[PDB]
Every structure is written in structure tokens, then in C-alpha cells.
Design a protein around this ligand. Sequence first.
Ligand SMILES: [Cl-]
Ligand SMILES: [Cl-]
Ligand SMILES: [Cl-]
Ligand SMILES: [Zn+2]
Ligand SMILES: [Zn+2]
Ligand SMILES: [Zn+2]
Ligand SMILES: [Zn+2]
Length: 151
Amino acid sequence: QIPQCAGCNQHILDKFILKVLDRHWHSSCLKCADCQMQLADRCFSRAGSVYCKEDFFKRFGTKCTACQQGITQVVRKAQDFVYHLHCFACIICNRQLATGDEFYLMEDGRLVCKEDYETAKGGGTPLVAGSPIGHENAVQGSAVEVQTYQP
Ligand SMILES: [Cl-]
Ligand SMILES: [Cl-]
Ligand SMILES: [Cl-]
Ligand SMILES: [Zn+2]
Ligand SMILES: [Zn+2]
Ligand SMILES: [Zn+2]
Ligand SMILES: [Zn+2]
């Protein structure tokens, strides 16, 4: 089926069809709201608009998953979730997780150290704590893929 552009809602007759996480785009509609630059690498969307990596970081403040508050300091990451270092902590024992620590990530971003998770015997994802990283590397935009309507 010929997709309608997520941006302009028109049918995309371009041979190349850009796909951003389950949505389809004209190449010419995937442009940063700020600097009007084509988005070929990846896409940063907030609210109802799209931005490049640079213009996005300078516009929106990344909010910690646990405390829901802004963070120019290094952060911790588990999957897509982003945390203050002091919020990267087990919800049961309140102990801060450190690089190398084994923990479980719950669906809503709640963190549980390995020992407390396994002691209590819902569904958690096993992970190993990575070292702190910068915001830039923290929030990786959505991948822009390319599809073509073929026979
Ligand atoms: Cl398609
Ligand atoms: Cl074409
Ligand atoms: Cl550490
Ligand atoms: Zn379009
Ligand atoms: Zn831009
Ligand atoms: Zn926090
Ligand atoms: Zn714990």
C-alpha cells in the first residue's frame, strides 16, 4: 500500500520512501523545524515537530526517568531510559548502581539490583550498568530507514 506521509499526510509517490519508526515520510518532508535541513541520519521528534540532533539538544531538556527532572552533566542509561547518576538506583534497597553492577530494568524504567530482584523471585530485563556518558550520546534519535514500493 502507498503510505501517506507522516508529515504532510499526502500519498507518497516517491520511489524512495523514508521510514521513521513505523511511520513513513517524503524525503522533502523530513526536515528540521529549526534549520530546515534534510534529516538523512536520524530523527529527533518532540511534540508535533522534527529536529536534527544539534537543534534538538539546544531546545529540549532531557528529563530523568526516575525523578522526571532536567539534567550538562553525565547520565546513566538503561535501554531507552535516561537517569541522573544518583537516580540510577535500586528501588528496593536505594543503593546507587555503579558501572558493572548487575540489575533488572522494569518496563516503566524502575530499576532493581540483581540481589533484590532475585530475592523477591514482575517482568524485568537483565542488564549490566554501563559507565556514565554525555547527553549527546545519551539520547540517540530515531533511525531513518529507506523503503521502496517494489513489485
Ligand atoms: Cl511502504
Ligand atoms: Cl522518484
Ligand atoms: Cl562507577
Ligand atoms: Zn510529505
Ligand atoms: Zn536542525
Ligand atoms: Zn533523576
Ligand atoms: Zn537493591
